[PDB]
Amino acid sequence: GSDIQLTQSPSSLSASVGDRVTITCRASQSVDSDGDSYMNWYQQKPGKAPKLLIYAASYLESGVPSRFSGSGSGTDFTLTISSLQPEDFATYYCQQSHEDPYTFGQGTKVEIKG
Amino acid sequence: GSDIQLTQSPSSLSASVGDRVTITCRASQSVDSDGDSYMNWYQQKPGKAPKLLIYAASYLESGVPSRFSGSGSGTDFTLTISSLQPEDFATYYCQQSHEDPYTFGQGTKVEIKG
Amino acid sequence: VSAYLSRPSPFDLFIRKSPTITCLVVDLAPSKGTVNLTWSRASGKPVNHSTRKEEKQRNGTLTVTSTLPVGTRDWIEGETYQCRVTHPHLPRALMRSTTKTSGPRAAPEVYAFATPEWPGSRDKRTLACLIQNFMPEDISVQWLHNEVQLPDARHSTTQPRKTKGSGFFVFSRLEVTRAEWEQKDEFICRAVHEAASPSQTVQRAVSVN
Amino acid sequence: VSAYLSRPSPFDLFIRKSPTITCLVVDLAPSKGTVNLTWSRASGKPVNHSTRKEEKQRNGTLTVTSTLPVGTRDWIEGETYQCRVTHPHLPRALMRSTTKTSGPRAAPEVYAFATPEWPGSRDKRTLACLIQNFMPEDISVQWLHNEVQLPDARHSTTQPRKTKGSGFFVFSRLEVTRAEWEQKDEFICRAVHEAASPSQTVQRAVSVN
Amino acid sequence: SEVQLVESGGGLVQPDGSLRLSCAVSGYSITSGYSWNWIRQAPGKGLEWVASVTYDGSTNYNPSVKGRITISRDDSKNTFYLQMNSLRAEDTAVYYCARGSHYFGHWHFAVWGQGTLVTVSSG
Amino acid sequence: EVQLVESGGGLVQPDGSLRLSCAVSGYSITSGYSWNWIRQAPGKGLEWVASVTYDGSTNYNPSVKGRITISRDDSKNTFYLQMNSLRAEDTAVYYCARGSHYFGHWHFAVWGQGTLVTVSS
Ligand SMILES: *[C@@H]1O[C@H](CO)[C@@H](O[C@@H]2O[C@H](CO)[C@@H](O[C@@H]3O[C@H](CO[C@H]4O[C@H](CO)[C@@H](O)[C@H](O)[C@@H]4O)[C@@H](O)[C@H](O[C@H]4O[C@H](CO)[C@@H](O)[C@H](O)[C@@H]4O)[C@@H]3O)[C@H](O)[C@H]2NC(C)=O)[C@H](O)[C@H]1NC(C)=O
Ligand SMILES: *[C@@H]1O[C@H](CO)[C@@H](O[C@@H]2O[C@H](CO)[C@@H](O[C@@H]3O[C@H](CO)[C@@H](O)[C@H](O[C@H]4O[C@H](CO)[C@@H](O)[C@H](O)[C@@H]4O)[C@@H]3O)[C@H](O)[C@H]2NC(C)=O)[C@H](O)[C@H]1NC(C)=O
Ligand code: NA
């Protein structure tokens, strides 16, 4: 109630190395403002802290591999891992920075096939 | 007989300096071949020899000011003088080089108003 | 519609100690309405006031530049500066970020030379300065004569290119006059680069004769 | 989609005496049908057989080149060569042309230098060559050691820029090894320019000691 | 050099009691910041932004906890702290300390600590 | 620079002959380029007439074929327009012109002063 809610899909997905993986984030209210979309993506491996991948919907954080790309606008956003690498298997979160309080998504697990 | 007739329009026009002049040259047959249109444009100040302005519809002859431009294809061609200079009042002829015999238009007299 | 964001020239950074960065926007055909340039810093600290110029082009286009003065200390310590261009024509905004170049640092080697007398043009002489094996590419070059810097438009400087090894190199050229080497026959080629220690200066003297 | 047409390098024109011109087409959106590429001369004389080359790109583009050998009398006397590219996805053909560059002619001056020993580089030396005051801008530059020309990838040459006066200038840089100058301590900086007299060649020798 | 955030104080915790966690920032001065945030992750739930303090002390709290929460700082130790009292079950979480970066009035958490585990008992 | 100088025009009675010459200087017609004659009735349009290429290849306009002849003289670097059976319609100013080449088709880039031929009544 009164918080911009974030829903991610799929809830979970397994893939192989080399695959292209797409994760959706849909916000309850638009997060656009002044020509940008304040939606940030995080990677978090088990037991360790999150890591900032993309900020403001589509900009790559310094020293992050180019295979991570973010896209979307308004209320729909998509993180894309173009060629899944072995160190890319983790839970992925989106988070809006448009209105207080800041809220995260529920998470999206990216598991290996076997 | 079966020459390619070239009709120009307007056959005579009055303009002032700085004005924009559009001259049309319509052909009885297509003058296209191999992705080009072989219609050239000449200028003839009174009492002197003609002078090549444009060749192959759109290519500006070396040393010709850029205010002369050529356009068109097939049977529909246009000379454009974007900013009429005072040394531009003359008769302008079109000429096709697609097939023998080479034929001209009848000329557009560009006269100064007054 | 392309946009660029430069780094401070090492001269403004280390010598003048008033470095600035310029956000350049070339938008080709400009439709109706104004284009905005807003700044931001990684730390959230305020931006200083930025100066802006627009210049109509002869090929039909619009050049829009914004220059932000930045702190000497803020830059060295690794602040990131961000430029945002918004155009009512454009659907989404443009963004360019800038920050200190991160990588190995290596101070430049400086060599200066003088041309001998060539027959005919005997009241002119050309001085040449090779500055090589430095990283990163950011470098500024000035020529000094009689303890005073010459106007910056007196010399040339090539774009930095890569050596066979690791460093970059640039050549600098300066025509000098007979009345200049007869007043004081000594010219300083000076290079300003972040890796030179201390005061970020390497220089070399050359004399004609 | 762009098209470029070069002149022959003054090396191929006056040293090899086998000058060629290259017509280049970078393809924006490739992979449609086949691209036709033909030649013509202003005088109506025939054209030699061109050589068709193409190489795919990593940024999704296609590059297509065609090299045409041309005469030496033909080029110097001012023949005009013309390249016409046709693509099934372009509405009408692209066309470029090339000819002897106009303007006054001035011979190049050549000055060759060598850098002193740099501690930590006792077996490397760097040679420099300044060629200036020539026009037109077409110029070829080579480094000769033991009277055999060195691999052109051993050195780098700047693109011609303008002097304060009327001429152009370039710099050329060459890292030589101790083995090379201990074999014979002479290196040649040769410049090939059409206005040079005679044999379109001006050169200067430089030593390390 | 590089910014490091190390949390401390996490441990077993009594209900309706209080809690105090610290974050030893080494490598950057929290006075020269950057916003400085607390973000928790309750078991089987998304991340929850909890509180923040900018470089000039400006404070912000998540309305869902505003009341039993306080974010403080000790410039002399270059540490900032998180205090929560009146603890219940939904406070069981892994508490993260994080340094947000600034984008035209908006913030993203670019540097994180390992986090520390806090568990509330029955009662 | 290439230059072209016509000569030989003047007053001539119908059905007679008249020879026009175009002296080329600055370029040799054997390393040409096409070389043409183009005429213009008084106050009317232009009409192409004949052309000799650098190797000697001639071309004519059907509307003059038979009674008009182009020829050259390498030794004088001049080319001529032979006019036999002068008709009234032949009253015009005769320009000679060098045609530059473009993929099998020619445009007339360099022109002469022209020469006036008048057919008597
Ligand atoms: C995707 O990848 C391909 C391949 O890397 C790129 O293709 C290049 O595209 C650029 C830009 O279109 C081309 O740049 C132009 O190159 C011409 C080639 O001349 C060179 O080679 C001849 C060979 O004899 C030399 O004589 C000459 O000195 C050059 O070294 C240049 O002539 C051009 O310069 C002229 O035009 C520019 C304006 O564009 C002026 O600034 C100059 O002053 C000059 O008048 C120009 O630099 C390049 O040739 C292409 N290379 C190849 C291998 O295809 C794509 O650009 C790249 N990116 C995409 C598609 O987005
Ligand atoms: C019409 O006229 C205008 C004015 O002359 C002209 O604008 C120029 O456009 C070019 C091309 O966009 C600009 O070139 C850039 O300039 C910036 C300035 O710092 C450079 O940093 C750029 O270099 C970087 O990026 C290049 C890739 O483009 C790299 O090759 C390079 O290594 C660098 O990474 C680049 O040179 C130029 O700044 C403007 N200048 C002005 C005054 O506006 C325009 O191009 C002309 N033509 C048109 C509109 O068709
Ligand atoms: Na915040």
Residue numbers in the entry:
A (entry chain F), B (entry chain D): -1 to 112
C (entry chain B), D (entry chain A): 336 to 544
E (entry chain E): 0 to 122
F (entry chain C): 1 to 121
Question: How is this structure described in the published paper?
Answer:
Here, we investigate and engineer the weak disruptive activity of an existing therapeutic antibody, omalizumab, which targets IgE antibodies to block the allergic response. IgE antibodies underly allergic diseases such as allergic asthma, chronic urticaria (hives), chronic sinusitis and food allergy. Most antibody isotypes bind their Fc-receptors weakly and depend on the formation of avid immune complexes for stable interactions, however IgE binds its high-affinity receptor (FcεRI) with a KD of ~100 pM. Therapeutic anti-IgE antibodies (e.g., omalizumab and ligelizumab) were specifically selected to compete with IgE:FcεRI interactions, and not target IgE receptor complexes.
